[PDB]
Copies of this chain bind each other. A is one copy, B any other.
């Protein structure tokens, strides 16, 4: 597509505690046929946080990496001091 593929963007609940994924009926059917014929299918999910920092898109999967990156920027270091781990 025209836009840069970054993967599926999650729509969070009001309380930002959960998000719901909708599966393509075609992939649901593929899943059921595989399940019924003993292939033990599973849908695997990989989630990352992304945001626009200086002029770039930064992505993170673990808070220690986010902490290391934010430590380098005055625009973030004090902001996330109370959320991020003290390790």
* A binding-site residues for B, Cβ under 8 Å: 6-10, 12, 15-23, 25-34, 37, 39-53, 59, 63, 66, 79-80, 83-84
Contact = CB atoms under 8 A, between A and B. Distances in A.
Chief secondary structure at chain A's binding surface: mixed
Q: How many copies does the complex hold?
A: 2
A8 B27 CA distance: 18
**8 pairs of A and B residues whose beta carbons are closest in the complex:** A10-B43, A39-B51, A7-B44, A8-B45, A16-B28, A41-B51, A7-B46, A46-B46
Nearest to A34: B51
A69 to B, nearest CB: 12
Contacts of A26: 63, 83
